Write a protein that binds this ligand. Sequence first.
Ligand SMILES: Nc1nc2c(ncn2[C@@H]2O[C@H](COP(=O)(O)OP(=O)(O)OP(=O)(O)O)[C@@H](O)[C@H]2O)c(=O)[nH]1
Ligand SMILES: Nc1nc2c(ncn2[C@@H]2O[C@H](COP(=O)(O)OP(=O)(O)OP(=O)(O)O)[C@@H](O)[C@H]2O)c(=O)[nH]1
Ligand SMILES: Nc1nc2c(ncn2[C@@H]2O[C@H](COP(=O)(O)OP(=O)(O)O)[C@@H](O)[C@H]2O)c(=O)[nH]1
Ligand SMILES: Nc1nc2c(ncn2[C@@H]2O[C@H](COP(=O)(O)OP(=O)(O)O)[C@@H](O)[C@H]2O)c(=O)[nH]1
Ligand SMILES: [Mg+2]
Ligand SMILES: [Mg+2]
Lengths: 430, 430, 432, 432
Amino acid sequence: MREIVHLQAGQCGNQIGAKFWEVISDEHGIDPTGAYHGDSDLQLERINVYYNEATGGKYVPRAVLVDLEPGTMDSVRSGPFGQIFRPDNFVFGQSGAGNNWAKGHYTEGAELVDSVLDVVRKEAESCDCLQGFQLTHSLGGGTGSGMGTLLISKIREEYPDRIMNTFSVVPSPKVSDTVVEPYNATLSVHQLVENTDETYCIDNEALYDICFRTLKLTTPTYGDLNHLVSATMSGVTTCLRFPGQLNADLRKLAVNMVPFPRLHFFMPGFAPLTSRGSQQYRALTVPELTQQMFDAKNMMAACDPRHGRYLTVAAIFRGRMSMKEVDEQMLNVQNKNSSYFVEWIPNNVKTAVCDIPPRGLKMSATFIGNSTAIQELFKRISEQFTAMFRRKAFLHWYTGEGMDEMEFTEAESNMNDLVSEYQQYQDATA
Amino acid sequence: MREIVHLQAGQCGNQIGAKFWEVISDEHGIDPTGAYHGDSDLQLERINVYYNEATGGKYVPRAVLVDLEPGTMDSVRSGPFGQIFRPDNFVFGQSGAGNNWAKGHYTEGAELVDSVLDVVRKEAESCDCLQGFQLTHSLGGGTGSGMGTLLISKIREEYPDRIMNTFSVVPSPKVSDTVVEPYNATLSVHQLVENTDETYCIDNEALYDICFRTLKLTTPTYGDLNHLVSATMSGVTTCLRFPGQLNADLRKLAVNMVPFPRLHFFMPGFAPLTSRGSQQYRALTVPELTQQMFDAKNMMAACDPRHGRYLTVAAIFRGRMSMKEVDEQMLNVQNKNSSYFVEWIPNNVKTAVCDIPPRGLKMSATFIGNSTAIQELFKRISEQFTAMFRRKAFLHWYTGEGMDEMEFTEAESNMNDLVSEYQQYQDATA
Amino acid sequence: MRECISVHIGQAGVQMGNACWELYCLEHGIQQDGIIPDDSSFGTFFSETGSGKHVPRAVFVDLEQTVIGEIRTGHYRSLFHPEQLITGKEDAANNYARGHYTIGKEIVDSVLDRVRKMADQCSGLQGFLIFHSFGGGTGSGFTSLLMERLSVDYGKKSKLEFSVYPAPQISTAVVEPYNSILTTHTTLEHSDCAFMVDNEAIYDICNRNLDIERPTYTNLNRLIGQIVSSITASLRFDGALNVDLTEFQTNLVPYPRIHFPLVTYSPIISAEKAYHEQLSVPEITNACFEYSNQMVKCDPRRGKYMACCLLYRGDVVPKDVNAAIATIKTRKSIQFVDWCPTGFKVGINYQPPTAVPGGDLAKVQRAVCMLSNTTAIAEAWARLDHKFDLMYSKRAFVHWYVGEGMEEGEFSEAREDMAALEKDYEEVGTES
Amino acid sequence: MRECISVHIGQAGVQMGNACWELYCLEHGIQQDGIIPDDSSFGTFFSETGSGKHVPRAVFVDLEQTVIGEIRTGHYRSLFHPEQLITGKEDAANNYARGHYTIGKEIVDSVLDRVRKMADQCSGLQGFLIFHSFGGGTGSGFTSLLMERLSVDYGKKSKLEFSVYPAPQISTAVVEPYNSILTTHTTLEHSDCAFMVDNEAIYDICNRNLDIERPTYTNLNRLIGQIVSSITASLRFDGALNVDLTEFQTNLVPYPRIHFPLVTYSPIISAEKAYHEQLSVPEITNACFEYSNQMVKCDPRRGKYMACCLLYRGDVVPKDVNAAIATIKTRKSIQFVDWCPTGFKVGINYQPPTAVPGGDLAKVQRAVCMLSNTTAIAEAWARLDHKFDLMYSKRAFVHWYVGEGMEEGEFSEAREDMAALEKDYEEVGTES
Ligand SMILES: Nc1nc2c(ncn2[C@@H]2O[C@H](COP(=O)(O)OP(=O)(O)OP(=O)(O)O)[C@@H](O)[C@H]2O)c(=O)[nH]1
Ligand SMILES: Nc1nc2c(ncn2[C@@H]2O[C@H](COP(=O)(O)OP(=O)(O)OP(=O)(O)O)[C@@H](O)[C@H]2O)c(=O)[nH]1
Ligand SMILES: Nc1nc2c(ncn2[C@@H]2O[C@H](COP(=O)(O)OP(=O)(O)O)[C@@H](O)[C@H]2O)c(=O)[nH]1
Ligand SMILES: Nc1nc2c(ncn2[C@@H]2O[C@H](COP(=O)(O)OP(=O)(O)O)[C@@H](O)[C@H]2O)c(=O)[nH]1
Ligand SMILES: [Mg+2]
Ligand SMILES: [Mg+2]
């Protein structure tokens, strides 16, 4: 029961997804061939959350891999843990999106989404109790931004009551990987604010600082970054898969983390994160884990929480700990930083403690934050969008696929409303 | 409880600091790798004063090593007991101060002090009961004089009620290691008289006499001098770390040694100090230890106490002794040398006896003296400063970094006030 | 002859149940199963079968299936009846509406059936012991749904409930004020007496007297387990002055809407420091009325006592109890309300408290559990109501509750009822 | 039936307490723990538990945690109740203000609680024995803070205190005159009788009669331990003429503000030289009134006696005491005040003094402790006041005291009170 169906999209999503299943399979003891060789029996009790069983002990991920080009999937199946996936779930086209939201959404993915849903429904109908859908993509491209948002709309229209959570890689402020990021991002956000319950925003620039400052990693590959993203993805779905003192279902987080419907954008974090040479200088106890979780330099999003206030916060601990330490430390953070927390919410921390930690770590903790400071990200995108849109920078590529300038204005207006809404609820009562 | 946080600064401070931790680790049984291999259990009871515990028995010094250049720290970590420090505490820049107080304080360290405080606060917040801060630096340079005084101001503004003690290497009268010593010293003193509770003044020239006269050392390296300084640094913080008949906390010394707020400059000493060939001609008993402690030829400061009077004096004994001998000997010194002691203070000696002596010595004793004769040091500096300042000797280097000639006059005026104050309280009642 | 039906709802109640049934099994000599190796004592909580298997008279219910599944895999797997362990499909997501309106409607008809099958098997029904959390989810919604069903099918039969009241400062969920008030509104007229405990208070006790700096939830549950054993000791064991479950109602409830006694357990003492203590009756009895030892973080001296039940155990002489209570009555600091000259209910039982192996409590000779109804608790309700007003002024999380069967009108009705309850506490606190 | 609550404050009192409780354990046959291997004597100082553990009726308090931590690690680690040993975070730094205003405010409420828990456990309360230093820090500030609390909660109950008075010449701290006067001001109206001892005087005794040239603080404490045992011997043991703690008040205190008796212990004799001494009652009694044997460096012949309490021990014949005191009365050098024709209080106890193993005192058959209230002590107060005037004229260290809760007005009030006390001593020293 409480099954999760994973849905890939684009190059970024597939790359992260491949790493995600490498991590998930590791903690569940699944070999790359699909066989189970774990030690503990607790990792096999709730294996149905992510995997479907087959004859001979083969466990198949409940994952759908989709992209408009064959290359990224071909890399996925060739790489480690690539044969674990079911071949029928590789729903791909031939002519890719050129990093334009219009093509992936209206022109290219429109003729392929119907096939994708034929695999999503088949996976969904095989669940004893469907909990939600898990989507990994990027907002800065065409396929993930365009095609991913198209699937979100289709599923939310077909499964209204199931929780939809997205792990989106957000464009960075410092430098870009694509000239048309503002167009792709603004249009994609127009669909997320309406058809998802919790989106975990992450930017590559922030992850570079984590590798540079904390991990002291001098040659950070994209595989290294995907490991950090995979860690937080696994953390938010541990209470479904392992026992714990105080459990926290995905919906249990949404209620505690989403006061108003549209303020559901989170910036994640993880701990412990230390370099190889500095590991022998750490106590590795609850007091210090909570000390760095709330640090602005350990969050995988660019926005600094110091520039705004936290509406809500979640700390999903893993490993055997003293619940007194967790409750006291969370309260201690609340008291010291009372200026950083919205006052009309008396308690701003949701605590979850899972008994089984990740492999190789005695203790671990994942940080989730719904902060009013995230409006900085959206407002920065709006400034970039209006500058390009003010003189029709690239619309002929988008309008050539069927879009209209009216849609761009609607997307911009909705983004401004969201930024304003975040500012409204940043002020005290009366 | 009663933790002390050690803060290095400049080449002189780091050099002395490295020797300091070699001595401290020795008496606490800590190996250079951080492991404990001592015999007695008393040296592990109060180890939290200087060290933080880590997994596997690793004990990490609560020390922050900072300098504007990487070289001195690179030498520290490469030398013995260099790996014991936590790497994160090496807060250093790239472009060093050129021995000008302005650059280290206003221009170069101003952009680095914020990072240093991020480590000081983290260390401080990990203490069960913070007692004070320990700073080792030199007044004759830029980094120690400039950057060190900047940290003193920041910490005293952030921890008003904690005791700040500094171990400063003072310029010598006979010869100089730097042409701009009067500028660096006078400006540095302007900050110490206001933002520290007890400064232990020491000059290299005095330590050369100790090595030449008493120790009969013919090849005195700077490591040899740092051992003498380390010995007195350890002595003033033994009652916090080991039991004794009559304890003396750092604050316990300040109250007994600081009658008025600004007369808190001390000249330290140590005993026993004998050569290798003259050791078999000494009784090594309390009566003779006290005999050389008050000798003007055994104090690590240039100022002769015979030229003024002692406001207060402290004798921190170590090792098992007869308290009768200590009380009688201290009284005997008081009676014989009544001309050397301020009369409006009925008792001018504070006695502390710790049970555990330093390694290799059955008995030991540290001398601390607040004497009105220390005005000779300050007045000598003032004469050097005014001669250079009378015709703008080097101000363009200091004024080029942002300083003003008004600040130099203020620093000189404050120094003259301190010298005058020492003279006022050198006269009897009415 | 006597019996008690124990319903454990939610994670807190279920996890507390494991501590309780690990202790009942110990006190009665059971072997972690239904087997007693080669008696009218165990009959109160355990039903017997011809095979020698003693079956707990309890129902474990949770919409979430993680915690109850752990029981099915733990050491007590073979103890409970498989149908007693009822598990749902999806949890309440810390939402009162889900537990009461959407999901609870698909499990209440099943749990009530097993209550029906248990009630008719008893020679004589005595009451209910309900364990649940006040924070929210199944402990707020489902409990109210089940409590109202019991009040109809079983009417005047006693219905006692043990609740983990929200702490003043510590909090583990963001919408506890919503859930706490909603369950309170729908349980005042269906509950006879609710005993309160706080996580924060027991953390202090576990660190102030028990010398443990790392309390888990297991430690707290064992402390709670002792309290319930002290309450139900009279039925299980013989004593000098027995007290029944139906006696708590008229003794601690002066008015129908004020039925929230506090809880206390005096000899919470470490094994090492017990060697330097006499642990006589007067000192343990005096310890109950100290703020430092209350299981709920509400200072008794902020208000006036109106009912106290002292449940002693072990080698206790009634003469000592008489003198010990009298001196307490003399103290002017311990102020009872004017209209209750008769303020103490005394229960003495011969069976001493049994220490769970691997626990922290010492091998105490005599223990006392105090159940005090005090006006000071009104301040705690005021604090809880204040939190609700702030969030509800902005409609902080109403869209979740309204979207799962509930209506906006319930928030106004629920809070207005609590305002009356706070006013009712003011009336009782004044005389003439 | 009788009892005494011993509070040991500061390093001096705590370290003196170790000597005292090492001797009480010896005299009562205890084995360095609460265990007596296979009686109404030990009940005065030790509480008993069913396990056979005898718990000291003492409270060890110190803002510093070094000295009390040593007790927790020493041979008597298992003796004291763990909660009796109360340790603070930071010391008083030899400052009266810190002990009384800043730090003492965070520990007094805790120590007074254990005094409350001890007082109510006694069959009958007799008084308090407070050990502290006069030099300063916790012994000056915290003692005054605690003494005033006792005077309110326990009122007329006896409150005796033992103080290490500052020496005339020897001194270990620079601000003793400030602390000594400040504690004296706040303890005159809350103390019934304070017994004085000086480090310098006992050093002379330990080197003038005991043939030891290397006295430590351990040696002095053992000498002090004997004195307290002699004072409390009547309660512990049977005797011919018993003296109670409440008797010292009216016998040695003629006026409320003059309650500072001196202390003396006659047979302080080495083992070797004891073989050449008769040690009869007349010679030991005569030794008390010699300046060379006083425990406080104040010459008795500089003033007039006004009250003397002779507490004998061992094989002592009351006829010898009667004659021995009478001949002393005859001597014209030993001048009593005119208004006290009745100047001697005699107490004889059968229990001889027990020699601590590893000590220096001989195995004396009979010992006498003299508690003499003499006008000569006024000179010592005058010397102490003179030191205060010099430092205060320059405001030598006032900024420390003023910066930690105290005010400048207290220095003027404190010294003015002492000036009255010195004047009061002059009035009592004159007749007609
Ligand atoms: N005393 C005690 N309280 C607990 C324990 N476990 C959980 N709680 C309390 O339960 C409160 C929240 O309600 P839960 O029991 O965790 O949630 P639930 O009843 O399982 O309902 P769901 O949200 O659907 O899972 C928390 O605030 C805790 O204080 C426990 O073992 N002992
Ligand atoms: N007889 C005796 N006197 C002692 C002993 N230890 C300390 N003293 C006296 O205590 C006086 C000073 O007070 P302390 O007890 O040292 O200080 P404190 O009471 O611990 O208060 P703080 O300053 O806060 O530490 C000194 O002048 C000593 O004469 C001891 O072991 N025996
Ligand atoms: N971590 C990670 N990020 C990626 C990877 N590939 C692309 N991205 C990010 O995705 C964005 C580019 O969009 P992309 O997904 O390539 O366009 P799409 O193929 O149409 O979805 C940039 O912000 C990249 O940082 C990858 O393998 N790993
Ligand atoms: N003992 C010792 N003293 C030093 C050392 N290096 C410099 N000093 C002293 O430091 C003073 C010079 O200031 P310096 O620290 O070099 O300037 P800075 O680098 O700006 O702090 C002189 O008085 C030197 O005697 C060293 O390695 N050992
Ligand atoms: Mg649950
Ligand atoms: Mg002390």
